């Protein structure tokens, strides 16, 4: 099981600086180039740089867009990869991936991390309020939701019954208004299963270390 995991992402002031991390495992870290790739929400992937393998001296190269301003390093005893970002602007706001790169032969990014989201804003970390969307109607199925309102920055995660409600879920893209995000998540279950069996939304906002469970009770 090759795994790549980015961390260090979150809210940063414009002009500020930030270091991201990429933890790797399940392959000989030292034999591979590793690259960093970013992506503004709704936009395209931009390659930022790589660091070569052992055989090639762990040397770095950068794209013209961030060259002289971003810095890649690796910890070969830990199988870790870093990106150091300086003098940030809102253009730098993006999900950042680390990807396994060249091994000396293959020309592919065979594996990618899940990405960590960076938001460059003077706005402040605001935790979310979480509201229960309870109905009542009737039908053979019933729809419930949670309203996640007034948080900053992105992202939040929403699960239902701790992930054991996986189908019938629609989590909607957040909308920004007056520097705050609001999104909702819907779940559809058999009318027969609710409210006999409980339905709970679990919302997380790691920027503010917020964790909320919200049980959906009949009004």
């Amino acid at each position: 099981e090759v795994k790549l995991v980015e961390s260090g992402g979150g809210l940063v002031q414009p002009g500020g600086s930030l270091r991201l991390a990429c933890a790797t495992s399940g392959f000989t870290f030292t034999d591979y180039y590793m690259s960093w790739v970013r992506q503004p929400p709704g936009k395209a992937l931009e390659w930022l740089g790589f660091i070569r393998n052992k055989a090639k001296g762990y040397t770095t190269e950068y794209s013209a867009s961030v060259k002289g301003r971003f810095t890649i390093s690796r910890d070969n005893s830990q199988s870790s990869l870093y990106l150091q970002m300086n003098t940030l602007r809102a253009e730098d706001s993006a999900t950042y991936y680390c990807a396994r790169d060249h091994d000396g032969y293959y020309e592919r990014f065979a594996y990618w991390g899940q990405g960590t989201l960076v938001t460059v804003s003077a706005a402040a970390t605001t935790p979310p309020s979480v509201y229960p969307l309870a109905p009542g109607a009737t039908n053979s199925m019933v729809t419930l939701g949670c309203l996640v309102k007034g948080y900053f920055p992105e992202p939040v995660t929403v699960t239902w019954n701790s992930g054991s409600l996986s189908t019938g879920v629609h989590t909607f893209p957040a909308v920004l208004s007056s520097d705050l995000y609001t999104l909702t998540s819907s779940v559809t279950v058999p009318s027969k299963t609710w409210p006999s069996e409980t339905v709970t939304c679990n919302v997380a906002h790691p920027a503010s270390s917020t964790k909320v469970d919200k049980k959906i009770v009949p009004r």
Partner: peptide, 30 residues
């Protein structure tokens, strides 16, 4: 080095379908 293109977004055409509509009042909490 490496450079990505701007991407092609592939969407899927299917038969028309009508929305299930659900309305929810404010929670006593809010």
């Amino acid at each position: 080095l490496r450079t990505f293109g701007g991407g092609t977004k592939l969407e899927i055409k299917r038969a028309d379908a009508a929305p299930t509509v659900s309305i929810f009042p404010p929670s006593s909490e809010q």
